[PDB]
Design a protein around this ligand. Structure first.
Ligand code: TTP
Ligand code: CA
Lengths: 554, 412
DNA sequence: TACCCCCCCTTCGGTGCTTTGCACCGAAGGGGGGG
């Protein structure tokens, strides 16, 4: 054979052998386009005829190249992949256009038949054994082994990407001022050189890629804006996503909503204010992906206003390392948040949204910190620095939250922006008992078998209540006892419980909850003027905690 | 040209596969520059995706360092080489180090680059350097010498180390020297002036053996324990006595002699929390006896080298932080409280990071171990910021806990 | 009827403490996107 570039050693998982599985019954329509290019590979040394000494077999199929009449070849190596050694992918993420610095001249070029321009490992070639069908079932068809990287193997991308880097390394060191964004075979080359000199250096690199046997076809070569790169349209001073088609289906299935949600999540990177909450509420707990499901009046309104944002075209800008990074967040309600990352005002680098509901009970302050953390990691990925934050929360509001909370929490450099709705704490437990407020000793208990329980209270002023509870748990009764004391008290109340579970939930000052019982406790706490919660151990003969422990067990 | 000591993982165990987390620009530039010179000096060499193992990497600056320092997070690799640095080539711990009036920490990590590494083991030291905005795929490397921050590195070099030290260990007989990871702990009862001089003597004594030292000053005798304390009030309310009883009831899992019967008697009624309660004779005496029991040591608390150290930290607010180091629950080997640390009254994560570093340093001096931390922080909050404030060359094991302070037992 | 990577949203169940209930988290299958 011939040796284009340095090979990469590969092994199998120790004590295991190759792929022996029978081919698919492929239709003759694909076989026509299949054996066509397949026989052309043998001329270039990409594929080779093998004798029956090779006892392996793996299925083969082909799909049309998207947006092309040409056909691409794919190999089902699922069983070979199971027994092939583990790798470590060198692709750690995806470039975003909002990370690109502005360059005077830019070139984008794709490498042709790339996995086929990289030699496989000598000793491993035998395991690629597959057979090519024919028009009829009389002729057998030649069995082949790959001499290059096959499309469909689990090691093909990693080996190409690492080999690509070693090829570009000499050029990158010889041209330190050339920016080469290397993503598989797609190369973004930009420079501040004059456009005449730029194309001169481009040809040097195309030659150096050619020296190592990497084709740079002119059809895939792009010299003029707007460059199509990573699904974006790159202009000299702006960028945007390639147009986004929203399905117009009159009756929606589950796979329709799924397709819709993903398109919107993709659009949320530049189109500001995309919301997916009410559309995703339709996909919860559904069995069939093909099942038809109606659109709620909530999701109908949400999809309507989402289409209005996509109506008018928007664009992003590029990164200026001299100027600061600014990230501003707005509250959209129902645990939904959107943000814009910019440098010059009203000229966005990119947008996004944080809508994750973390935990059973939360508040807007918790969710705002989580959105700040998502943005920070995202910004460290793209620009390698943390942005300055403009947050819709008063400085005193935050100062009260993080100082009092029992867990460590923090927000990077940030300033208050008065854009409503503002984030706030909806109530505050007193640090010390309230003089003149009635003192409610609450307790609750439930029977493990009967699922029946009681929840009640006793007060210093003689007040009392006990409520029978049906199909409940020990925890729910402990919360219920506090709900009763909150309902039956004035604006200022002292509540003494023995429930660790309930006190932990309430002390975190939630304003939203999955539990409807907690929402009613939250609703009551917002109405109060002074609440003081305390904790005492059970069965210690303490206070009214012993007297109400008797009432709720009878 | 030195013989390479063979190293094998724990029986029936696979190498570390841990993804590389995003790095800031200033850290990636520092890493590429550190790794370039480390490559032309043969300390590391590039590899490919055929190596299935990976370990995270980032950079730090020591306290006032101003110079970047490479740091690899070998915690996962160290858990899989545990047979090596404990059973086989371990280092004895000097129980007298914690008794010295001054102890100094020196970064000897640059000497590990002298000794080569076993060829069969180099496949496990693989790490990947990321690129800003994924301009380039991950550039992978491998260690050819003893890596900085691997637990097997000081054990292999121990033979070489004890030889370099032997002339100085004889010239100064009663000075204690301990080696943990990339750090060398040196302590004496000499005066501050004599102490810092003998350090420089040890620096030059290491220079002629081929090592630089890019010093931290401790005082283990100064360290003070934090005990459980009961308040002093001229008048007690129902809430005061309720809080006190819950505290004493919780403290009863440590000091079994705590009694509550006479204090619970004072609560028998259903009273308003703010009502003042005069104390009875037997209650005041039960309270007096409890205050004395809390002066006593916990019965039967001792260090077991076979068990892991656990470290719990509680945020007390207004800059204060408390911690307890234990092996079995409620059998606390040490308790303490930190205040007015860097970032106090402004940054919670920085203070917590500074607390972890101080606690680990104390654990290394006292027991020669690093404890597993129960951190009162959310995972996403900690994993975002903790590298910005990390100033140590080791990284302890940690987990995250959410335990609301229903009873303020470690601080009034 | 293939491969690798990143993102969001949902399900589901392991883990450990709030305890045999409840809360949290991470893997996974759905989708979007790139080559
Ligand atoms: C698009 C695509 C690429 N790949 C792999 C195989 C490719 O060699 C490599 C890049 O694919 P492409 O760039 O789309 O095509 P190509 O590199 O073979 O050459 P040309 O553009 O002239 O047709 O990534 C897949 O495995 N499945 C896919 O759907
Ligand atoms: Ca191509």
């Amino acid at each position: 054979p011939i040796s284009p570039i340095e090979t990469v050693p590969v092994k199998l998982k120790p004590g295991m052998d190759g792929p022996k599985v029978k081919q698919w019954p492929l239709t003759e329509e694909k076989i026509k386009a299949l054996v066509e290019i397949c026989t052309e590979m043998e001329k270039e040394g990409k594929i080779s005829k093998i004798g029956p000494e090779n006892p392996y077999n793996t299925p083969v199929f082909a799909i049309k190249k998207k947006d092309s009449t040409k056909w691409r070849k794919l190999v089902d190596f699922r069983e070979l992949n199971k027994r092939t050694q583990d790798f470590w992918e060198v692709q750690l993420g995806i470039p975003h256009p909002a990370g690109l610095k502005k360059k005077k001249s830019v070139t984008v070029l794709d490498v042709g038949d790339a996995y086929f321009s990289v030699p496989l490992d000598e000793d491993f070639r035998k395991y690629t054994a597959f057979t090519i069908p024919s028009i009829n079932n009389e002729t057998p068809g030649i069995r082949y082994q790959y001499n290059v990287l096959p499309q469909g193997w689990k090691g093909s991308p990693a080996i190409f990407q690492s080999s690509m880097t070693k090829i570009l390394e000499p050029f990158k060191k010889q041209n330190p001022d050339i920016v080469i964004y290397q993503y598989m075979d797609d190369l973004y080359v930009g420079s501040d050189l004059e456009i005449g000199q730029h194309r001169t250096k481009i040809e040097e690199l195309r030659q150096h890629l050619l020296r190592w046997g990497l084709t740079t076809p002119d059809k895939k070569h792009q010299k003029e804006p707007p460059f199509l790169w990573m699904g974006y349209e790159l202009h000299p001073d702006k960028w945007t996503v390639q147009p986004i088609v929203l399905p117009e289906k009159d009756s929606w299935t589950v796979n329709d909503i799924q397709k819709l949600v993903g398109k919107l999540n993709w659009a949320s990177q530049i189109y500001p204010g995309i919301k997916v909450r009410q559309l995703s509420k339709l996909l919860r707990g559904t069995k069939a992906l093909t099942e038809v499901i109606p659109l709620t009046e909530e999701a109908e309104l949400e999809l309507a206003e989402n289409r209005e944002i996509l109506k008018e075209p928007v664009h992003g800008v590029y990164y200026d390392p001299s100027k600061d990074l600014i990230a501003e967040i707005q509250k959209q309600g129902q645990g939904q948040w959107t943000y814009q990352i910019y440098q010059e005002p009203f000229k966005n680098l990119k947008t996004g949204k944080y809508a994750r509901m973390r935990g059973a009970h939360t508040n807007d302050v918790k969710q705002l910190t989580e959105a700040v953390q998502k943005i920070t990691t995202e910004s460290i990925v793209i620009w390698g620095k943390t942005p300055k934050f403009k947050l819709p929360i008063q400085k005193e509001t935050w100062e009260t939250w993080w100082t009092e909370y029992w867990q460590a929490t923090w927000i990077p450099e940030w300033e208050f922006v008065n854009t409503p709705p503002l984030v706030k704490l909806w109530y505050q437990l007193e640090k010390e008992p309230i003089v003149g407020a009635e003192t409610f000793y609450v307790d609750g208990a439930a029977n493990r078998e009967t699922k029946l329980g009681k929840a009640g209270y006793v007060t210093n002023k003689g007040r009392q209540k006990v409520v029978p509870l049906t199909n409940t748990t020990n925890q729910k009764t402990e919360l219920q006892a506090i709900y009763l004391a909150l309902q039956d008290s004035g604006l200022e109340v002292n509540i003494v419980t023995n429930s660790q579970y309930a006190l932990g939930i309430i002390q975190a000052q939630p304003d939203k909850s999955e539990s409807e019982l907690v929402n009613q406790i939250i609703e009551q706490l917002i109405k109060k003027e002074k609440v003081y919660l305390a904790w005492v151990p059970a069965h210690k003969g303490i206070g009214g905690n012993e007297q109400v422990d008797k009432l709720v067990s009878a | 040209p030195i013989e390479t000591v063979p190293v094998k993982l724990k029986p029936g165990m696979d190498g570390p596969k841990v993804k590389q987390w995003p790095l800031t620009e200033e850290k990636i530039k520092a890493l590429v520059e550190i790794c370039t010179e480390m490559e032309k000096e043969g300390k590391i060499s590039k590899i490919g995706p055929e190596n299935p193992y990976n370990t995270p990497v980032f950079a730090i600056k020591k306290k006032d360092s101003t110079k970047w320092r490479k740091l690899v997070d070998f915690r996962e690799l160290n858990k899989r080489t545990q047979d090596f640095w404990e059973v086989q080539l371990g280092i004895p711990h000097p129980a007298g180090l914690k008794k010295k009036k001054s102890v100094t920490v020196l970064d000897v990590g640059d000497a590990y680059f002298s000794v080569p590494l076993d060829e069969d083991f180099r496949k496990y030291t693989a790490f990947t350097i990321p690129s800003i905005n994924n301009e380039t795929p991950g550039i992978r490397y491998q260690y050819n010498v003893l890596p900085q921050g691997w637990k097997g590195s000081p054990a292999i070099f121990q033979s070489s180390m004890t030889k370099i030290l032997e002339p100085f260990k004889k010239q100064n007989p009663d000075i204690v020297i301990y080696q943990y990871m990339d750090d060398l702990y040196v302590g004496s009862d000499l005066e501050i002036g004599q102490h810092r001089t003998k350090i420089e003597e040890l620096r030059q004594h290491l220079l002629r053996w081929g090592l630089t030292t890019p010093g931290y000053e401790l005082h283990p005798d100064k360290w003070t324990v934090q005990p459980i304390v009961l308040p002093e009030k001229d008048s007690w309310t129902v809430n005061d006595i309720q809080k006190l009883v819950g505290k004493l009831n919780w403290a009863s899992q440590i000091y079994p002699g705590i009694k509550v019967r006479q204090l619970s008697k004072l609560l028998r009624g259903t009273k308003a929390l703010t009502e003042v309660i005069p104390l009875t004779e037997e209650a005041e005496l039960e309270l007096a006896e409890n205050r004395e029991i809390l002066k006593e040591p916990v019965h039967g608390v001792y260090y077991d080298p076979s068990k892991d150290l656990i470290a719990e930290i509680q945020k007390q607010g207004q800059g204060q932080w408390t911690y307890q180091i234990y092996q079995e629950p409620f059998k606390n080997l040490k308790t303490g409280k930190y205040a007015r640390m860097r970032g106090a009254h402004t940054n919670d994560v920085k203070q917590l990071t500074e607390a972890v570093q101080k606690i680990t340093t104390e654990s290394i001096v006292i027991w020669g171990k690093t404890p597993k931390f129960k951190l009162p922080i959310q995972k996403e909050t900690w994993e975002t910021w903790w590298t910005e404030y990390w100033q140590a060359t080791w990284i302890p094991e940690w987990e995250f806990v959410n335990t609301p302070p229903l009873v303020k037992l470690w601080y009034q």
